């Protein structure tokens, strides 16, 4: 079996992308943020504290003939941007793009932090990292991808995120019309539960490629591209009006500027992020200052290849027993 679903950014900045996903029987369609840097599938539901629900579509497990309460089980999760939620757990049928899994754990939020309440377009998360990071207790639950592997034509999914445009997640096959040239595969380390790999280096604009190991994670659920301080400072050194801004939290530059491209190595191959991708948007509507898409990972702890990086490529998440990460230009 396979599935194919369209993913759309939630706003004009590509801050995040949502993908529809059918839960329950009959189907209830919620728009979830597909998150390769977490391993929980949780949704707003009829159980979420009323005052904490602002425009989102909720999952009512009492309307679903196939839902089963997973008794005893609760979950609690916090994320890098400080948001958090917790609740209890049902199992139910979940379909993505025509690909159906039965007895998927669907984590029902009893409470949600303020940034999730403030986000009317995101009805919950679908996590696609390794199931070791799942927060359900006392027994951890499998991700939608892990549940689907038995039935997939090939154990893979692909992420093809658009630049200010829709994209696609595919499960179970690789669309050879979606990319150019060939995919290069690089090893994944699952030691920390992430889709963690090591880039072979970087170039800025049309200067030299510098061979240097950059260990980081591929995370569809992070907006920007976070790299070590001295690489990020090499990049913005090529943009004449760029400076680090403590008020806004990162490098800003005149929106006027044509930004250089940024290249990252995957083994012997090169992926090039266009300049315009790195222009993330003005810091305010009408401002002349724009916020950069490449920022220092020094206060995160880990380098993150986020949506800024991933939307310039076709990315294959190869979940065979020894996983790998594939990138092609598109």
């Amino acid at each position: 079996s396979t599935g194919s679903a369209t993913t759309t950014p939630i706003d004009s900045l590509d801050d995040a992308y949502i993908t529809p996903v059918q839960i329950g029987t009959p189907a209830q369609t919620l728009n979830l943020d597909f998150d390769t840097g977490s391993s929980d599938l949780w949704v707003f539901s009829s159980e979420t504290t009323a005052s904490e629900v602002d425009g989102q579509t909720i999952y009512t497990p009492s309307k679903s003939t196939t839902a089963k309460l997973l008794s005893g089980a609760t979950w609690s999760i916090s994320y890098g941007d400080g948001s958090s939620s917790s609740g209890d757990v049902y199992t139910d049928t979940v379909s993505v793009g025509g690909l159906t899994v039965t007895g998927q754990a669907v984590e029902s939020a009893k409470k949600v932090s303020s940034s999730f309440t403030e986000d009317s377009t995101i009805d919950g998360l679908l996590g696609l990292a390794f199931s070791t990071l799942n927060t359900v207790s006392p027994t951890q639950q499998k991700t939608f991808f892990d549940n689907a592997k038995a039935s997939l034509d090939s154990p893979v999914f692909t992420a093809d995120l658009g630049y200010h445009a829709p994209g696609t997640y595919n499960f179970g096959f690789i669309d050879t019309t979606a990319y150019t040239g060939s995919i290069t595969y690089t090893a994944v380390s699952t030691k920390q539960g992430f889709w963690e790999w090591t880039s072979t280096g970087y170039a800025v604009g049309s200067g030299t490629f510098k061979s240097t190991s950059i260990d980081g994670i591929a995370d569809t659920g992070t907006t920007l591209l976070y790299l070590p301080a001295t690489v990020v400072s090499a990049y913005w050194a090529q943009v004449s009006g760029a400076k680090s801004s403590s008020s806004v939290g990162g490098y800003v530059f005149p929106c006027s500027a044509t930004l250089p491209s940024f290249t990252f190595g995957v083994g012997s191959a090169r992926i090039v992020i266009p300049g315009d991708y790195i222009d993330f948007g003005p810091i305010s509507t009408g401002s002349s200052s724009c916020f950069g898409g490449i920022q220092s990972s020094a206060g995160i702890g880990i380098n993150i290849f986020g949506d800024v990086a991933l939307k310039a490529a076709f990315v294959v998440f190869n979940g065979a027993t020894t996983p790998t990460l594939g990138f092609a230009s598109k």
Binding site: L13, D15, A16, D33, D35, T36, G37, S38, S39, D40, I77, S78, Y79, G80, D81, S115, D119, L125, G127, A129, L133, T135, G193, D219, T220, G221, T222, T223, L224, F280, G281, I283, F291, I300, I304, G306
Partner: peptide, 10 residues
Amino acid sequence: PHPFHXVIHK
């Protein structure tokens, strides 16, 4: 404006 950063474990 509003960038996202999805899990913490240890």
